[PDB]
Design a protein around this nucleic acid. Structure first.
Lengths: 254, 352, 256, 254
DNA sequence: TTAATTTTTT
DNA sequence: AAAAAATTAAATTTTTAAAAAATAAATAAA
DNA sequence: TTTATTTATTTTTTAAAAAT
């Protein structure tokens, strides 16, 4: 009864390459208001909240609430069969345990039917109070990939600090100390390469860098990263998926 | 065989000791005092007290250890000359009698500990019991003859001939943690040459030229210094350790002034034994002729080596085959020279 | 108090990418005349003579001739944090204990301070005389990189034969035989893809290939390789970078 | 004496890159009409019929019909020395037991002479004649390469089917099952990307995708691949190279 | 062969 | 305090594999 | 093509077992 024609087929490929190494098994909680995915880590440290609304899908036909368990390594190697320009249709039925994926291509005449067996899993559902966070930044995603990828060579801990000049990333380890300071943008008026800081108070928390390396696998999804955190809440790494969905990554402080 | 010489060179002349890497000596011809290495393998390599021994009854722990150490000696590129001891002199007879008395006390304490039942005490008291026979050195010389790696039989002492091979330039350095090579006259001495993947100890390289520059002595005053602070050839004077022997050498040079001016009422000369025979035996020993040796590292025998080590020592095939393959790889790689043969070393940069 | 703001940090990143595979632990002889590094291989058969003169840096400043030793793997991992156009600013404080590395991107304002722990070395620097070599070969650097990279698959040693017609690279192994023979470019269209030979007398020497691969790891630094060699004299593999210094490379021949 | 100039040396380079993974050692048959290789796999399940005829060679000279034993990994490494624009001159001196490979650069500066140490190896050739094949398809080789890289994740089995509509690449395994439907098109304006299908019988054949991945590793040779098959005859994977020759890949079904 | 450490001593 | 002598007190190196790091070999959209 | 990015054989690494 479930059908979801996603026309810009790089989106689900980027979601499965983002969540392949982090989550091994989860539950794609699919409702009539849009596909959701709220899951904890396999190592049980990081919370992943994925939500895509129905307006981005070209033909989203969802009769009722589907809560089925999808293996993410299986679905990631199924989305590795898809091209970067095709149309992904998620035909499904609740009678059999089949998650059928059909890949219509625009360039070619390819029809790639891919039915996947699904395992029964306990659906985790942990809420988040939607609060106004302390330091909410809007900084480039390639910059966050670069910063986490280079600070992970020093150690497994980053001290992300916000200030009036901007965000400061500080990692300490055996090779030494690495401080990365990102300032504002004065008069470029770009607002995708530009870094904007929304802050009420300066904070200083220590975050693990292996989970940030897992979080920076979502960098082709968006050109912006919305890191929003406070002094006690987990860091929220939000990737705006094509203005039609969001992928939120939660990380407890170290 | 000098009691407190490496600590002395670590104290008063730090420029001599350069704790280098084992990778650093690529293609260096090296003479090695081998009998202490034989006791290092027969003491160390034990399967829980019992020495590594085979079906016929003899032990083969030294064969095991120096096959494996010599293969990773060529894998770092060091070319060894395992020099074997000969007849010990009559001046060494007192120290060998002391070693035999200590071995007899270790045998009596082993017979106590065998009835006691503690396994660690028995394995330590047989770790202070190890003494070779000419059959052991014959088995080792059979290993080195099948190795294609040259052995040399010293006439009197292996470290004296090692020092002569450094002095003639036939080898670059003498490799033993025994400290007598600097007494016998070797410019370069290589302590702690252990060819292991577990590189826990750096190669302690001792330079005699920096010792004689730093202390301001010739060979004769250094021999008198080692005689005063204690050798395995003659007894030292009681009450004089390292530092007062250094001061006594530095205030007047020869040992004849030391025995003729220092009063017996405070530091008496024990037994009135003449130290000049030990002096002339350190300077001019019964030593191997260094121009008559054949220091050639030939191609190793493989099939006769397999036949030896697995027909009368019953080893395992694939480890010897990997060792001979690493030996063949090192023999193909050993033709590369150093930059020290072309460009001279004009100092060493030291950081803060 | 040492400080050197280098406006082209890709050059120093390529220097440490070159030096990382060959030397694991090296000592930097930084003086007021320039930045120097003279350290051999761990097998002590292959020397590097890095020179970075003070005219190549923009704001070079060094009070005392401070010699410090870093881990080149760690310094390479910290210089991989810089981008391709990131301005690398050296800083060593007076009574130095650490080295600070500031990476500034030109367009985006971003200060990537990287403090790096120093360590103690005893590295033998060597007096190389200013001698003139008979076989001096200028090559494109990617061509010499290709030649060492594909003759490494054949054997362990390259016989570099030098003729007036051109340099000949011969390697023999158990896989087979190989003979890469070059020619001096009589028709030169471009300088960077031309081979010039500067003969005094013909030489014929054999060199190992592992250290030659470590020399051709310096390929994106300069587009020219000055292969200078003579009979039973070590080969100079000079990577003369653009108006900032020169990266020498020494290698003892496989003598027979 | 055998001497064979070959200007487009990239073609022989990807021939050896294609035959590096399958064959370790085979008898390179030399004839007056060209170089032949009716090799057979080291796993002994598939046959390789390489035929590069002598008219596409620029200067071909052959006196004796000799078949030297060539280590394919060694000639793959020696052709990995050869550049993509290098004029390759194959040579074989009589009474030398050495296949000499000479690479000439497009400029007259670099000459790369290499040699081999051959072996006294012989093989029993079987010989499969080309009869009237019933079912022949002809898709672009990159698309078939993408199809095998798609289906190799799901399982080590492909069920290649055909009908009046088009070829069906069915596969199944532990990850689910995947059906790739590729239909024929009536497009004569493009030949290297359009698909023509000639069918006589509706046939279902089950293969193994490891050896089909090794045949997939030949696709940079041409943008045209050919899967001719019938009910009981083992299929070919014919690689339609230009006037130099071709490359066939026989494979027994599972 | 060489250390490490408590004891003893100038 | 500085410095000696009594009394022990230690001598190795594979292969195997748990855990982590680096390359070139593919892999391929950007 | 060129530049980087993943997969994944290749290596060290400490720390365990036996090595005959």
């Amino acid at each position: 009864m479930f059908e979801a024609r996603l026309v810009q087929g790089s989106i689900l490929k980027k979601v499965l390459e983002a969540l392949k190494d982090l989550i091994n098994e989860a539950c794609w909680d699919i409702s009539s208001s849009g596909v959701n995915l709220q899951s904890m880590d396999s190592s049980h440290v990081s919370l992943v909240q994925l939500t895509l609304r129905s307006e981005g899908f070209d033909t989203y036909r969802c009769d009722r609430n589907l809560a089925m368990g999808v293996n993410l390594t299986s679905m990631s190697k199924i989305l590795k069969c898809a091209g970067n320009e095709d149309i992904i249709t998620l035909r499904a039925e609740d009678n059999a345990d089949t998650l059928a994926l059909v890949f219509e291509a625009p360039n070619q005449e390819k029809v790639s039917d891919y039915e996947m067996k699904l395992m029964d899993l306990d659906v985790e559902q942990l809420g988040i109070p939607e609060q106004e966070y302390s330091c909410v930044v809007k900084m480039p995603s390639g910059e966050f990939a670069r910063i986490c990828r280079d600070l992970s060579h020093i150690g497994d801990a980053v001290v992300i600090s916000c200030a009036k000049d901007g965000v400061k990333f500080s990692a300490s380890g055996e090779l030494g100390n690495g401080n990365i300071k990102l300032s504002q943008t004065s008069n470029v008026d770009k607002e995708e390469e530009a870094v904007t800081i929304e802050m009420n108070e300066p904070v200083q928390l220590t975050f693990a860098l292996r989970y940030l390396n897992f979080f920076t696998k979502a960098t082709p999804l968006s050109s912006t990263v919305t890191l929003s955190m406070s002094a006690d809440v987990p860091l929220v790494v939000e990737y705006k998926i094509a203005d039609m969905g969001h992928l939120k990554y939660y990380l407890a402080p170290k | 065989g000098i009691q407190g010489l490496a600590k002395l060179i670590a104290d008063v002349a730090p420029s001599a000791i350069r704790e280098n890497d084992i990778k650093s000596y690529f293609g260096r011809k090296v003479a090695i005092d081998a009998s202490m290495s034989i006791y290092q393998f027969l003491i160390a390599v034990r399967q829980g007290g019992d020495v590594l021994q085979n079906e016929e009854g003899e032990t083969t722990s030294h064969l095991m250890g120096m096959f494996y150490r010599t293969i990773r000696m060529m894998e770092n590129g060091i070319k060894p000359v395992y020099v074997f001891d000969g007849k010990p002199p009559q001046l060494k007879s007192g120290e060998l009698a002391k070693r035999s008395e200590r071995r007899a006390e270790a045998e009596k304490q082993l017979q106590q500990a065998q009835a006691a039942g503690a396994e660690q005490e028995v394995e330590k008291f047989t770790k202070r019991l190890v003494k070779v026979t000419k059959q052991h050195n014959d088995e080792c010389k059979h290993l080195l003859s099948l190795m294609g790696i040259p052995y040399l039989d010293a006439p009197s002492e292996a470290e004296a001939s090692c020092a002569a091979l450094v002095k003639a330039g036939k080898v670059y350095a003498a490799a033993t943690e025994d400290m007598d090579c600097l007494t016998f006259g070797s410019p370069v001495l290589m302590r702690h040459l252990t060819a292991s993947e577990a590189k826990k100890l750096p190669i302690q390289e001792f330079h005699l030229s920096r010792i004689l520059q730093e202390l301001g002595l010739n060979q004769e005053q250094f021999v008198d210094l080692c005689i005063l602070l204690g050798s395995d050839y003659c007894e030292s004077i009681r009450g004089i350790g390292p530092k007062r022997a250094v001061d006594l050498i530095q205030k007047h040079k020869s040992i004849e002034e030391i025995v003729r001016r220092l009063d017996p009422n405070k530091y008496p000369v024990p037994e009135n034994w003449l130290h000049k025979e030990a002096h002339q035996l350190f300077l001019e020993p019964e030593v191997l002729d260094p121009e008559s040796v054949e220091l050639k590292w030939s191609e190793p025998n493989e099939e006769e080596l397999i036949k030896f080590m697995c027909g009368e020592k019953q080893f395992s095939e694939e480890r010897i085959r990997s060792g001979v393959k690493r030996l063949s790889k090192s023999r193909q790689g050993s033709t590369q020279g150093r930059l020290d043969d072309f460009f001279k070393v004009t100092g060493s940069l030291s950081s803060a």
